[PDB]
Amino acid sequence: ANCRILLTPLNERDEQRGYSTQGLKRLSGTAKLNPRLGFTRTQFVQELPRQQKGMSIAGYQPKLQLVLDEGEFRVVDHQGNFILKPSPADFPGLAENEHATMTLMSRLGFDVPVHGLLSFAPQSEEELEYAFVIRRYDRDNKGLPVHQEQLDGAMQITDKYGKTGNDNEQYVSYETLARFLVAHVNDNIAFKIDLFRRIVYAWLLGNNDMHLRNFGLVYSDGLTPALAPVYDFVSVAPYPEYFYSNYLALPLLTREEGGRELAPGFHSDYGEYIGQDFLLLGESMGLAPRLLEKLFQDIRKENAIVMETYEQSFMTQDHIQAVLQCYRHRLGLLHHHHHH
C-alpha cells in the first residue's frame, strides 16, 4: 500500500498501520505519533445552511485548530500549532485532493509545510473518514509566533479577486502582483523562478482559486520579508462547473486588467492561455529567454512525478483521471511559443 502522509510504498513492518515511520517523523517529529485522533467527526463540527451557492469551493471547508500533546492531538479554541480541514459534506473527497496536490508540490521542490491525512473515530463501525492536517507556518521552534501578512491588505486591495471597480472586471493581475513582491522581498533569481513556477503549476493542475489571500509575507528576520509557503493548493478540475468559470483566478498579464486588452493566446485559434502568454510573464519578471526555455523543458520531464503521485493518491479514481486530463491538455499548450 501507500503511506497516508508521504504516499510512499510501505514496508512489511509499517504496512498494517498504514503510516510509515518516516512520515510520522516528518509531521510530529516523533515516531510515537498516533494518527487515529479519536474525536469523531460529529464531535467537533457544526452544520448549517449554505451562505451563497457558488461561493468558491473552499468557502465551505471547515477548519479546526489542533495541538499535539504526548503523541495525541487535541482541539484548542484559540492559537494552535496544527490546522485540521475535513472534507465538506457537499464535496466529499476534498481532503484527499488537497493532500495529493500538496504532496505533489512538495516533491516538485516547492516550500510546502508538513502535511498528512488523519483518521476520524468510527461511530457505528463505518469506514473511517480521513481529514487533512497541516502545520501553521506562523510558528517557529517551540511554537513561538512569527508575524505574517496577506497580500490583499499589503497591496491595499479591497477584493481578493481584484474586482475593485464600478463595473465587474478584475483590475489586479499576476504580473502586477509579481512586481509588488519583487520590490519588498529580495530580488534573487531563486525567488523569481519559484514564483513563476507557482503560477504555471497552478494553471497546469487546474487551481483557479489562487487569489491574493492565498499569498503571504512572513517577517522572520524582522525587516526583510519573504514569500510564504504554498498553502490551500487544491485542484478544481474534478468539479466542471467550478472549473469552467475561469482559467486562473486572476488575469495573467497586466494588459488584461479591466477588460482593456486580451492575451496573445486568446486571439489565437486555441482561445486559451498558452505558452507564449506565460513566456511574456517571465520576461516581465526579468527572466531571460534561454532560462525560460530551460525552465519549460524541466516542467515537461516532470510529468512522470505528476502522474505517479496522483495515481498513488487516495482520491476517488474518477477524480484522478479528471486532474490528469486537465494536466495533459494544458501541458501541451506550453509548446505554442515556437521560439528557440
Partner: protein, 100 residues
C-alpha cells in the same frame, strides 16, 4: 463608537478608533519598532480612512469560519470591527486586537 487597542508581538503598539465620520488607526508615541503592515508604515503615525483599513478588513475570516458567528449574533451585514473583536486572539501571525 468603539475603542480597541492593537498589540503586536504581545506588547500594545497601536490604537484603533471608530468615530462618527470614519476609522483612525494611530501608533503610540514611543513606538519606533516594526510596522504591523507595509500598508501602515511606522514612520507616518496618522492613518485616517472613512473605510476600514484594508489590512484590518483582510484580517477577518470568511466563509464557514464567519458563518459560525453569522448564526450566533447574525454577523451578516454587521460591523467588521465586531467580527475582529471576537477573533482578536485568534488572529494569524503575531497580531492581537483587544479592547481598552
Amino acid at each position: 463608537h468603539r475603542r480597541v487597542k492593537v498589540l503586536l508581538y504581545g506588547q500594545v503598539v497601536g490604537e484603533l478608533s471608530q468615530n462618527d465620520s470614519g476609522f483612525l488607526f494611530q501608533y503610540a508615541h514611543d513606538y519606533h519598532g516594526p510596522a504591523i503592515s507595509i500598508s501602515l508604515p511606522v514612520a507616518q503615525r496618522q492613518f485616517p480612512s472613512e473605510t476600514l483599513h484594508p489590512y484590518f478588513a483582510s484580517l477577518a475570516p470568511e466563509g464557514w469560519l464567519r458563518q459560525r458567528y453569522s448564526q450566533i449574533q447574525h454577523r451578516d451585514e454587521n460591523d467588521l470591527l465586531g467580527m475582529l473583536i471576537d477573533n482578536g486572539k485568534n488572529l494569524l501571525g503575531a497580531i492581537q486586537i483587544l479592547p481598552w
